[PDB]
Design a protein around this ligand. Structure first.
Ligand SMILES: C[C@H](CCC[C@@H](C)[C@H]1CC[C@H]2C3=CC[C@H]4CC(=O)CC[C@]4(C)[C@H]3CC[C@]12C)C(=O)O
Lengths: 10, 242
């Protein structure tokens, strides 16, 4: 759900 | 005059955060898209992916950035990403040659006329708006790595981005912005007192142009052709009919 968000989390 | 030791310490920290920007790609599909003699819309999206991922990496390794809530981090990035790309575009752009020269890849250039492939009724306005923003950032300042790195952090910590609802996030972003700006002020006087004041007083005008230029850049890929194979990240910021 939103590559942007994933990049942030991981 | 000279900078205090405290400022120098901050500038070291900033220098380390951006040292990931100008570095070799350890990817071959990525280095292949750059060294490409030709850049169609799909390729431009792929190139953006490189700068964006690096932009996001830089934000993560930033102490100040890790002072904001999670929801605040996303809102800051989503909201300033095209602005930071554009800034990055200013710093590697060759006015006379009309091409972008990346420091991470020698002998690799990107035609300014790639706009001629983008949304037809808007490509002209965006070309003109990009040279405008560029022409507002004088040479001496555009060539100074630290100076532009500081401005990149000022646009990043924009207290008015859609989504910064936490009063805490808003307060800390506001303070971070104030300090970064001051740093730039004293930094400018330390490297060229002759006209630091007028140089510093002009950059806010340039930031107004940056906002406007980046803002109407979102639909540039409408009418540009099939881009389905382009990297996915950049398509979260640029609208597409694919
Ligand atoms: C190796 C790679 C080169 C990056 C060059 C990059 C800074 C250029 C290439 C395409 C350019 C733009 C495309 C869409 C346009 C759309 C606009 O109207 C604003 C400017 C914008 C974002 C420019 C900025 C500079 C970009 C990303 C890198 O340094 O990471």
């Amino acid at each position: 759900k939103s590559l942007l968000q994933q990049l942030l989390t991981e | 005059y000279t900078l205090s030791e405290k400022d120098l310490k901050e500038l070291d920290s900033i220098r380390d955060s951006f040292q990931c920007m100008n570095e070799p790609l350890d990817n071959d599909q990525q280095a292949s898209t750059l060294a490409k003699k030709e850049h169609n819309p799909t390729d431009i999206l792929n190139v953006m992916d490189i700068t964006m991922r690096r932009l996001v990496k830089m934000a993560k390794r930033l102490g100040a950035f890790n002072e904001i809530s999670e929801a605040g981090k996303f809102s800051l990035l989503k909201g300033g990403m095209i602005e930071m790309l554009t800034i990055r575009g200013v710093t590697v752009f060759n006015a006379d040659k009309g091409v972008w020269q990346t420091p991470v890849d020698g002998h690799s250039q990107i035609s300014f006329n790639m706009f001629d492939k983008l949304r037809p009724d808007i490509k002209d306005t965006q070309k003109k708006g990009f040279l405008h923003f560029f022409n507002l950032l004088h040479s001496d300042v555009r060539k100074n790595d630290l100076a532009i790195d500081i401005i990149v952090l000022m646009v990043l910590f924009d207290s008015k981005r859609e989504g910064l609802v936490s009063q805490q996030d808003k307060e800390t972003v506001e303070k971070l912005h104030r300090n970064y700006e001051s740093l730039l002020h004293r930094y400018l006087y330390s490297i060229h007192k002759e006209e630091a004041e007028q140089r510093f007083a002009s950059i806010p005008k340039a930031l107004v142009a940056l906002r406007k230029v980046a803002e109407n850049a979102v639909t540039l890929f409408l009418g540009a052709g099939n881009t389905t194979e382009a990297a996915s990240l950049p398509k979260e910021f640029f609208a597409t009919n694919y």
